[PDB]
Write a protein that binds this ligand. Structure first.
Ligand SMILES: C[N+](C)(C)[C@]12C[C@H]3C[C@H](C[C@H](C3)C1)C2
Ligand SMILES: [Mg+2]
Ligand SMILES: [Mg+2]
Ligand SMILES: [Mg+2]
Length: 335
């Protein structure tokens, strides 16, 4: 059981003080945008506790920056679940819907009266880029493109009905998990700009990749029950079981080891970051932003796991949205 699985990550070093204020803003935001309705959808959304995910996952965010984190997560989760139904078995249709969203990334604003997912994403994206450094905008725009474009490949895999090999699983799963977007968001919400010289060091590139893998793999373990019965194939536990011809328990144990090896690698490289900044001759302010970036990555890993142990999303989904029907109460994404 997930209640008996722990990945060795520390508890969150801090929780953003803006949790309760953001809870109020974000509840109004999802309702105003039409992303979440009234009744079952609202009770189901509330049970996820998106504000606590934002406050635990992004403890550096304050005020309106935490609101952006919660709203961004709300979009990610509501959009994700729209594919838990016929859309997720229709790759060509999924690719067309995701092309609509990708157009918003690259300038084509949806216009008045767009669907709730398009309108919500356009609002998150506009708030994200306002005052952001152009290097951040360019990188994050390509991250969003990968996220949207990957969804149809998860649908292809569902039709195939076998997990991919490890390399192909990582290519699809890193995309559908939102790639580096949670870290780009945390950087933006902390108000920092990572100097490119540090950002592209081998240490920080490996650490960034490791942190994103850690959260999606921790999710794969905790979300397997609601995913397996829907025919989902891009889950690390299923990938290992398929590749190794092992038992479920052996696959879960191996999945935990894949998380642990990445945590160990992250922390080994983190010890080199002060010296790296000195070799590059970064200014004191630049080193401060790098130090915050390190904490943003550490907090995303520990904060995501802290959230997923207390949310009702993973324990609740199989009972309120059984696999015999769609994984949502309301369609909000026109296809
Ligand atoms: C993109 N969604 C919302 C599915 C996730 C965002 C964050 C990173 C992945 C795992 C969970 C936390 C869920 C993906
Ligand atoms: Mg998904
Ligand atoms: Mg999902
Ligand atoms: Mg999952």
């Amino acid at each position: 059981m997930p209640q008996d699985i722990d990945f060795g990550l520390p508890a969150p070093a801090g929780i953003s003080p803006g949790l309760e204020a953001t809870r109020r803003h974000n509840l109004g935001w999802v309702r105003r945008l039409g992303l979440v309705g009234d009744g079952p959808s609202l009770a189901w959304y509330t049970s996820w506790d998106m504000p606590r995910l934002a406050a635990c996952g992004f403890p550096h965010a304050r005020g309106a920056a935490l609101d952006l984190c919660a709203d961004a997560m709300a979009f990610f989760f509501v959009f994700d679940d729209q594919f838990d139904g016929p859309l997720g078995r229709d790759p060509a249709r999924a690719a067309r819907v995701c092309r609509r969203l990708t157009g918003i990334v690259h300038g084509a604003g949806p216009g008045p009266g767009a669907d709730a997912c398009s309108a919500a994403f356009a609002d998150v994206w506009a708030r994200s880029t306002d005052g952001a450094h152009p290097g951040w905008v360019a990188r994050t725009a390509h991250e969003w493109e990968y996220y949207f474009a990957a969804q149809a490949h998860e649908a292809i895999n569902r039709l195939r009905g076998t997990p991919g090999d490890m390399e192909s699983y990582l290519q699809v799963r890193r995309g559908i998990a939102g790639t580096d977007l949670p870290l780009s968001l945390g950087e933006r919400a902390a108000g920092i700009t990572v100097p490119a010289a540090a950002f592209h060091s081998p240490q920080l590139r490996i650490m960034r990749e490791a942190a994103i893998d850690v959260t999606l793999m921790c999710n794969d373990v905790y979300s397997l029950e609601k995913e397996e019965a829907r025919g989902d194939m891009d889950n690390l536990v299923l990938v290992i079981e398929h590749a190794r011809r092992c038992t479920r328990d052996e696959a879960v144990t191996a999945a935990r080891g894949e998380v642990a090896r990445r945590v160990i690698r992250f922390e080994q490289l983190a010890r080199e970051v002060p010296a790296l900044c000195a070799q590059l001759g970064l200014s004191a302010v630049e080193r401060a932003h790098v130090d915050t970036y390190l904490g943003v990555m550490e907090a995303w890993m520990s904060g995501y796991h802290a959230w997923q142990t207390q949310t009702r999303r993973y324990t609740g989904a199989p009972h309120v949205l059984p696999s015999t029907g769609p994984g949502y109460f309301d369609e909000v994404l026109p296809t």
